[PDB]
Structure formats: structure tokens, C-alpha cells
Write an enzyme that holds these catalytic residues in place. Structure first.
Site, PDB file in Angstrom:
ATOM      1  CB  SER A 182      18.678 -11.743 -44.072  1.00 41.99           C
ATOM      2  OG  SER A 182      18.915 -10.336 -44.887  1.00 41.99           O
TER       3      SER A 182
ATOM      4  CG  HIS B  77      16.236  -6.800 -43.343  1.00 39.87           C
ATOM      5  ND1 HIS B  77      15.708  -7.737 -43.998  1.00 39.87           N
ATOM      6  CD2 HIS B  77      17.662  -6.880 -43.228  1.00 39.87           C
ATOM      7  CE1 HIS B  77      16.619  -8.511 -44.312  1.00 39.87           C
ATOM      8  NE2 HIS B  77      17.727  -8.304 -43.994  1.00 39.87           N
TER       9      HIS B  77
END
EC number: 3.1.1.107
Length: 242
Positions: A137, A224
Site C-alpha cells: 500500500s 487489498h
């Protein structure tokens, strides 16, 4: 980081402290050394961001598996806190300066490469030619920013870089590199979730075309969140010679 407190038969741990220059951020770095003898050239090494999170999810099945090949020394650069993630700290240390407080990547890199790394590899046989860097991320963006300027690391694992939030230009900067000083450098972008694919595809296409050793690790439909685990475990597996 409980497996550190706990303890593994495959690895032994040690925690150490560091502070940012401004003195408002405090780091907790866990160094995991394989309990199995290091190869002549030395143990490969992987520096990992979001250290508290990695340490809290590190399991023995994985350690065992890494031990099946050439187990790496793991450096989980975390923060002095009780939660797995320090949202404000990482939000600043991992975002590129070029493009809440953000843009502290260069200073965090300075801290990492000239203070933490030198200290933790001390008294250890490390294949310094086999150093790796992993981030997810925002951590993903830091790896890209590092790929663009560091000569400290050899392998770079950018996972689910959140470029779609004021950092889209980073990918552009990456695909823009000069063919000279990047021809051999390694760069592995890791994604899942499910035209982000196209952009990654294109990127690797242009980079390979320039002669760059770029690769793509795909994990279809992994959110994610689940990508954190997948990428951090696969990178370790990869660096161990899988």
C-alpha cells in the site's frame, strides 16, 4: 510481534529502538535470524515495512518453509506502539517527497539505510548483495520511490501500491527512468484485487523493453487487505530462493 515474545525453533529474535530526526516518531525494529546455519555467501536479508503487522502475523509454517531453502534474515521495521499499524507514522514515512503530513520517504530512507540497516546487520553474515525491500500500500509507494534512488537494495517488492491517491505520477516516474542506471535492477510489482492491470502491464512492458528486470506477481481477486499477507509471505519465499 508476539512470535518474537513467544519464540520460534526456526528463528531467534531481538528488538531494538530508533527515533526519527525530528524526534516525533519512534521505531521498534525486530531482527529475525534463522536458527539454521547461514550459507557461505551469507543469509539473504529482507527489510519489511509495517513491522508490527508483519511480526503479529508471522507464523512457524512459513518459517519452516523458508527453512526448506535458504532462509533470510527478516528485519521488520515497525513502530513503538501496541497496534499492528501506525497510520499517521507510516502515512508520512512511506510517501514520496517528489509528489495529514506526507512526503517523508527520503528521510525515512536516510534513517533506514544509514542507521538501522548498518546496526542490525552487525555481527551477522549477510549476503549484502542479496538485500531486499518489501512494502504494501503506502509501503508499496516507498519501495517504488526507493527503487528510483537507492543502490542499497537489490530486490524490490512493491505490493498493492496505493498510487491512485495523489501518487499516480510515481508510476509515471518509474516507467520514465533512464535506461542507463536501471538496466539490471530488479522490480517486482505485486497486485491482486481482480485499468490498474493495464497500467501495470504497460509499465512492465516498457521497463522490460528498456532492459529492466521487472516482474509481476498476480493474485486474482484478493482484496487489498489479504494482499498484505500474500505479498509479504511470497516475497520472503521468493528471496529464500523459491
Amino acid at each position: 510481534p508476539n512470535i518474537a515474545d513467544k519464540g520460534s525453533v526456526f528463528y531467534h529474535f531481538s528488538a531494538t529502538s530508533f527515533d526519527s530526526v525530528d524526534g516525533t516518531r519512534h521505531y521498534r525494529v525486530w531482527t529475525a535470524v534463522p536458527n539454521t546455519t547461514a550459507p557461505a555467501s551469507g543469509y539473504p536479508i529482507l527489510y519489511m515495512l509495517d513491522g508490527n503487522a508483519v511480526m503479529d502475523r508471522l507464523d512457524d509454517e512459513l518459517l519452516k518453509q523458508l527453512s526448506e531453502k535458504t532462509p533470510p534474515v527478516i528485519v521488520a521495521v515497525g513502530y513503538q506502539t501496541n497496534l499492528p499499524f501506525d497510520l499517521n507514522s507510516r502515512a508520512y514515512d512511506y510517501t514520496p517527497a517528489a509528489e495529514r503530513k506526507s512526503g517523508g520517504s527520503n528521510n525515512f530512507r536516510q534513517l533506514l539505510e544509514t542507521r538501522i540497516a548498518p546496526k542490525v546487520e552487525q555481527g551477522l553474515n549477510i549476503d549484502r548483495q542479496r538485500r531486499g525491500l518489501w512494502g504494501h500500500s503506502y509501503g508499496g509507494l516507498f519501495v517504488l520511490d526507493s527503487w528510483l534512488s537507492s543502490s542499497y537494495f537489490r530486490s524490490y517488492y512493491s505490493a498493492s501500491p496505493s498510487l491512485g491517491r495523489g501518487y499516480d505520477a510515481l508510476l509515471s516516474r518509474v516507467t520514465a527512468v533512464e535506461p542507463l542506471q536501471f538496466c539490471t535492477k530488479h522490480l517486482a510489482i505485486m497486485e491482486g484485487s481482480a485499468g490498474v492491470l493495464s497500467k501495470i502491464h504497460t509499465t512492465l512492458t516498457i521497463l522490460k523493453d528498456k532492459g529492466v528486470n521487472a516482474v509481476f506477481w498476480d493474485f486474482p481477486n484478493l482484496g487489498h487487505g489479504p494482499m498484505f499477507n500474500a505479498s509479504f509471505r511470497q516475497a520472503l519465499l521468493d528471496i529464500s530462493g523459491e
